[PDB]
Design an enzyme around this catalytic site. Structure first.
Site, PDB file in Angstrom:
ATOM      1  CB  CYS B 172     -14.848  28.829  51.960  1.00 56.41           C
ATOM      2  SG  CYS B 172     -16.285  27.521  51.209  1.00 56.41           S
ATOM      3  CG  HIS B 303     -17.951  32.778  55.828  1.00 58.70           C
ATOM      4  ND1 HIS B 303     -16.465  33.061  55.923  1.00 58.70           N
ATOM      5  CD2 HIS B 303     -18.440  31.857  54.886  1.00 58.70           C
ATOM      6  CE1 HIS B 303     -16.798  31.805  54.699  1.00 58.70           C
ATOM      7  NE2 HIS B 303     -18.019  31.186  53.872  1.00 58.70           N
ATOM      8  CG  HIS B 341     -17.314  33.346  48.449  1.00 58.35           C
ATOM      9  ND1 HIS B 341     -16.482  32.339  47.809  1.00 58.35           N
ATOM     10  CD2 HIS B 341     -17.354  33.783  50.066  1.00 58.35           C
ATOM     11  CE1 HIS B 341     -16.387  31.040  49.363  1.00 58.35           C
ATOM     12  NE2 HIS B 341     -16.505  32.449  50.383  1.00 58.35           N
TER      13      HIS B 341
END
Lengths: 862, 862
Positions: B172, B303, B341
């Site tokens: 990520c 996030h 996600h």
């Protein structure tokens, strides 16, 4: 709570490559790679390290590293479960990164918390398939052990780096891409250092078959620039480098002039076809942006894969962009012909060679170049010349091309660092080399290498810069003496817990002829003694003569003993302070309390020497009556009860030693009476004077009158443990400053040496600072068994410098930090380019007892 | 041979995000994502698109794109073998990159050869395991189709980019890392544009099981900022964006204020634990380097993975770095709660939302936020406020975080672009919208969307900027009319080969009442007519009055016919030139040769109008005895001989039709004799004149005398095909300049229309420029069947503007480039932020007939 913003500003200075390390085919370290390159040894071999030579029809020969099954997990804080589910590439990369960090003169403590970025280059993900074929529970940790994004992060996590950590995949040109990213981040102000590196290990034979299906691989080795070239051979690399700002680097292999990247774009010959025009444009852009005259390039590390369609285009670009206007042939070469093709890590391989070419000042030969390629006109026009044998590269610029599969070209330029070494005052005198390692064998190898370079002081400085690592990381601590008349070497495993250092200063009885005469070799010792002699000269005392040409008869007198003992103690304290030894505690016997005060900072050299001189003067001038001192074998209380009139217990040395002293007559009859009951009452010749008794009532006051006008009161630190004032009276004002009153009290009151020693811990390192180890037995009996006891000098030794160095080496081996190079002028950094490489020693000094899982061929079939 | 070095200099301007496109869960385009986000529609569903909802015990719900089996290989030049062994992620990324390029107002030809860098972010490599389980020959192409390094390179190869192409793997935060790299390369001068993007598809359920093994995944959806949050749900993304210099961008969603990266370093809570201190330090550094007031942030894309240990730390950093000093709550949010996600692509998702939040001027709501997390203090003290419903974001700065696993954080700041649209003179008058696409259905959808935005001219300009792509790329060419009284729409498949455009100018007879009256609506046409009228005014002719208020009695005379037809021809030529139509060939009938001269550049407006005026005056000034002309259906060799003395054959219209011209008596008699024999002697009005005959001897000379002092000789280009001087005299000097001699010759000599038409190719697009479509039948019979024939005007039509637009639309549909927006003032770039997105149309206008291989679950087990 508020956080201070970091100053991110452009950097206009130089960027230098400081460290290099890695595993290369048939080479466990950089030294082996250099030896193979300079000896024309082919590093591609035929064996079954990965798979049988011919399994599935794959090419027999390959470039394989020695071992990929070893990893010092406990060093990096990786538990067995995590290490087992850990890519061998990442483990080797971590080890190589640590080795490179050590090579650049850095250490774990120095590199921790710095703004360093990691730019790893990795593309091989065959371990995922191998470990997932029979996936079971407990393999979850693979996310943090096998993912390619964790390769840099782990490096950032262990070393505590706080810079951009990234993993790149540009194929073949990936390593120079990482170098370019590191340069970009360095010049913007984000980071001060970079850990650019890359890895590539072969696990899957089907990958080799798939590569062969595209005609990538040839039959024989990589015959770069050869008319018979038809492909390349796969290789394995786990190398990495460290970059830093040139103004803070302790070692500079070379300077990164600049790197650039581009893409070929769209061409009619296919995506997998090199574009000579794009490469020429890239090289022109890089050479024009930095104003580098292309005619100054001495060596060119080409991307010589050996392919028929690749070499001609690279050569044409080189000739069109670099050879234009050159007056002599340009020496070109490639490391692929030596150790094969490294694939994604290929870019690092050439860099490694460059460093070698920029460290040994010689260009390694190129193998398999027999007949020049007819498609290469340059080789016949004199513009180009493949280096088929060692060439003396004197200096200049070296250019590297790392064109990649898919069409992402990359170029870089490096400028040589010319700081040829110059002689140091050391390198011909004995020196103390202290280091730490993970294994005893590794430390022994490190010591052997250091002895091999005993004449180099820059290498010693580089080793010392990382020789103070805590025992937790490197437990095997060792010390040796270089340029030593007698061989010395000590190695021991040091516990993680840090022990306490307690300086111990001896009193009288350590005097002898020739004291500190050998130690005069050290510059600091001689300077300290000269300063003390100059200070004492106005008083009619010539310390130099007494120390050098003094005889036994002179030492028999009262003053010279005190003067010389104090001077030697001060010189030893100065040596220890220069080395950087910080005493966690200080204790001293009679006449040693002055040295303790000097070391603690409460006293000064002049004040200490004057205190000793005044003690001697008070003792001599006064007509103190014929006195006697004797070391009875009685206990403190028992001696305090047996003490007859005119007799008082002076020094409580050990639990079974007392220095009962008094008048000569009373002492004589008491001696005979104690020996009648029966106890070992040895006579201590005290120059026939009874110290620390009622007989000192007159001199002590005199001493006070002498010292009231000189000693400036100063506080006493908790480190110094008084041996004259009882603990019950420590809180009182008298026990707060070492003024004239303190000196008079210690010269008058009894010495409570045992009480002071009791405060020492059970595992403390006590250093006996004195002309001789007089109190060795007393201290050993007092402290216990778990405390290390050393003496900096030995009585009537033939070489006291060696004894001093050996005692200090033992102290370091027991876990006390020190700087052995503090006794000589500091080495100017960055060191000369002639300094050997420190990466090898660490590479061969690892703890590789355990074997971890490696992908197996059978896991790739199903 | 030498290559000019590129100027690599630092860039100090603004960087703007121009294009956005991508595939998101339950969304085939950006429009669907926006609609779902603003309608509180959950994008994570339960079904068996990838695997059964519960296979191997994996979580049932997941975020999956609509389809991954579609790809327009022929568009990208990928053969079937290569496409089959190609990752679906790469194919979707290529399509999305093209869509984003089109969205930014760019095209294939405009982006070709530019210094653009590709910074793809991809980590998933499960396709390798799927395809290598049963590997067989013909799968070698996987090197160029499956390798991660090929994801950017392919994009660079197809679009011909010549900038750094790289693939990043940072878990990520990869998208933000790529954005940072693009910013670094943009500010240093290597590149001018960037194709930052990323993709992430799910194929292996065992990967989901592995992630669950580490407690990454929760039970329900990503309940960001919710006390019940216990994990995240995997998602799929294939989005990408385009970045450019703000001074050259045609559309600016926002401006990239700055991006920064750092690593959490070492911590005692483990490597996979967020570090709030590191994130706060990164925020402070980014907000201090750019001097951005942290209190000016309006929205914060967090996030928000929903993990218990992640959200509190991120929020703590946000309200310690950003909320300090803020006087109102900071609106925080995260797109993870909407579509799950994205893992490696997660960052891009946030960017997408930002663009939406920066385009619609509304903040999408956050789903599943029911009870604030007690561990998040800021949600109770009023410092923070999760956006649970649509909020009117007016303008300011938006900050995005992409904290990833391992500890490599990334932060970015975007500034809104406030250029609210303003009205244009167009958007209420009919306009011609021309475009191209891969499929007829896609083109129809594009036209429907354009009609939906018929009142927007900026959208029309953006579509136009990529509406001239060659047929080889986009074969389906189409044209429609927006704001049209009558519906018009043409779509046709155009062959790759480009046809030749031939302007054809008709002669007399095209006069009628109202010629060009409708075309006066266009500004260019009216300005041209006014200029011609002003030029002719000094000579006592009111062109304006004749054109508008003229009656049939007006055209009964000779002078008004010539003047009006020529003025209309010049106006049409000016319109065509303004639209940017370059005629590859030119031909004209009698009185049309002046128009050809004007369009060819050999003549000027004034010179042409005065040549026409002199032609009319030469016949209305000198006495000419009455005569006539007829249309005898004789061949040239038949007619020319059949006509008696005086009667001659004037113009060779087609292979069987010939004008005959003579005196009123000779004529009538010969025409009657003809009519006896089967021949269609259809007389034509000429004001009792016989042009192009011996009678024209006297006027022609007069004409020369009139034009010798005005027409400046100029060379005649090869494009213009003379219809008065036969081929045998084209090389002669007389046929070199269109001076008075040429005018006299063409008014005297016969018109060889058939000979000129013979030169036209067999498949040329002939545009008949005249007040009315006279020569359609003659021209059609002349050329043949494979040529396209169009007339810009229709006689007595109720709306000639629509006819003109339809003619231009047909011409474009048959493969001629043009600029329909050239008739109106140019649109100022960058366009207003209110302009809709063009990516959706291209995304839904692909050719997806074929289905390619996709990894199957069964290939991951063995």
């Amino acid at each position: 709570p508020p956080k201070t913003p970091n100053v991110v500003e452009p950097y206009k200075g130089e960027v230098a490559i400081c460290g290099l390390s890695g595993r290369y085919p048939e080479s466990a370290n950089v030294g082996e790679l250099e030896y193979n390159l300079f000896n024309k040894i082919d590093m591609v071999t035929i064996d079954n390290r990965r798979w049988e030579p011919g399994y599935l029809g794959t090419p027999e020969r390959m470039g394989k590293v020695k071992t990929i099954t070893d990893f010092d997990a406990e060093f990096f804080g990786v538990h067995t479960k995590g290490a087992q589910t850990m890519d061998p590439m990442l483990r080797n990369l971590l080890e190589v990164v640590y080795e490179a960090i050590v090579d650049a003169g850095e250490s774990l403590e120095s590199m921790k918390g710095t703004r360093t970025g990691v730019y790893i280059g990795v593309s091989n993900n065959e371990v995922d398939t191998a470990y997932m074929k029979n996936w079971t529970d407990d393999d979850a940790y693979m996310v943090q052990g096998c993912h390619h994004s964790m390769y840099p992060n782990w490096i950032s996590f262990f070393f505590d780096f706080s810079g951009p950590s990234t993993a790149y995949n540009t194929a073949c040109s990936t390593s120079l891409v990482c170098l370019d990213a590191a340069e970009r981040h360095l010049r913007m102000g984000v980071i001060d250092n970079a850990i650019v590196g890359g890895s590539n290990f072969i696990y899957r034979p089907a990958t080799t078959k798939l590569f062969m299906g595209m005609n990538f691989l040839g039959s024989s080795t990589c015959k770069a620039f050869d008319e018979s070239g038809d492909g390349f051979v796969r290789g394995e690399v786990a190398s990495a480098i460290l970059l830093k700002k040139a103004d803070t680097a302790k070692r500079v292999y070379c300077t990164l002039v600049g790197s650039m990247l581009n893409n070929d774009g769209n061409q009619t010959n296919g995506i997998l076809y090199p574009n000579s025009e794009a490469q020429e444009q890239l090289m022109t852009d890089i050479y024009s942006t930095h104003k580098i005259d292309a005619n100054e390039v001495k060596y060119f590390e080409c991307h010589g894969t050996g392919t028929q369609a690749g070499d001609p285009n690279e050569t044409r670009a080189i000739c069109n962009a670099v050879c234009k206007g050159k007056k002599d042939p340009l020496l070109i070469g490639s490391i692929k012909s030596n150790l094969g093709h490294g694939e994604t890590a290929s870019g690092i391989n050439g860099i490694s060679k460059v460093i070698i070419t920029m460290h040994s000042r010689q260009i390694p030969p190129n193998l398999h170049f027999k007949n020049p390629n007819p498609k290469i006109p340059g080789l016949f026009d004199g513009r180009l010349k493949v280096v088929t044998e060692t060439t003396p590269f004197d200096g200049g610029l070296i250019a590297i091309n790392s064109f990649g599969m898919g069409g992402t070209n990359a170029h870089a330029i490096f400028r040589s660092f010319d700081k040829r070494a110059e002689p140091h005052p050391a390198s011909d005198k004995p020196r103390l080399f202290t280091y730490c390692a993970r294994t005893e064998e590794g430390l022994q190898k490190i010591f052997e290498e250091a002895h091999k370079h005993a004449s180099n002081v820059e290498f010693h400085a580089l080793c010392q810069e990382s020789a103070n690592t805590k025992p937790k990381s490197l437990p095997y601590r060792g010390a040796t003496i270089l340029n030593a008349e007698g061989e010395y070497t000590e190695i021991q495993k040091c516990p993680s817990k840090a022990r306490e250092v307690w300086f111990v200063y001896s009193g009288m009885g350590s005097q002898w002829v020739g004291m500190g005469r050998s130690l005069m070799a050290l510059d600091v010792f001689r300077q300290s003694i000269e300063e003390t002699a100059a200070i004492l000269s106005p008083f009619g005392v010539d310390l130099m003569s007494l120390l050098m040409d003094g005889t036994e008869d002179k030492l028999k007198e009262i003053m010279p003993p005190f003067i010389c003992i104090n001077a030697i103690q001060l010189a030893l304290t100065d040596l220890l302070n220069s080395m950087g030894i910080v005493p966690d505690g200080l204790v001293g016997h009679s006449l040693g309390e002055v040295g303790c005060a000097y070391a603690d900072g409460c006293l000064t050299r002049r004040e200490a020497i004057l205190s000793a001189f005044w003690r001697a003067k008070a003792v001599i001038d006064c007509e103190v009556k014929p006195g006697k001192m004797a070391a009875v074998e009685l206990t403190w209380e028992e001696a305090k009860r047996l003490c007859p009139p005119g007799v008082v217990a002076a020094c409580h040395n050990s639990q079974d030693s007392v220095t009962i002293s008094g008048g000569a007559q009373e002492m004589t009859k008491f001696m005979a009476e104690l020996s009648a009951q029966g106890v070992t009452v040895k006579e201590v010749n005290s120059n026939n004077i009874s110290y620390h008794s009622s007989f000192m009532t007159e001199p002590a006051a005199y001493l006070k009158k002498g010292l009231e006008k000189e000693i400036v009161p100063k506080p006493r630190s908790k480190k110094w443990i008084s041996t004259s004032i009882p603990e019950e009276r420590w809180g009182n004002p008298e026990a707060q400053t070492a003024d004239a009153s303190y000196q008079a009290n210690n010269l008058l009151s009894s010495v409570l040496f045992y009480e002071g020693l009791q405060k020492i811990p059970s595992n403390a390192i006590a250093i006996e600072i004195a002309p001789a180890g007089l109190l060795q037995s007393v201290i050993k009996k007092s402290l216990g068994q778990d405390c290390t006891i050393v003496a900096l000098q030995k009585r009537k030794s033939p070489n006291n410098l060696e004894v001093f160095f050996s005692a200090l080496g033992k102290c370091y081996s027991h876990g006390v930090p020190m700087n052995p190079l503090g006794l000589y002028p500091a080495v100017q950094f960055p060191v000369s380019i002639d300094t050997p490489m420190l990466s090898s020693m660490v590479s061969e000094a690892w703890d590789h007892s355990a074997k971890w899982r490696v992908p197996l061929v059978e896991e790739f079939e199903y």
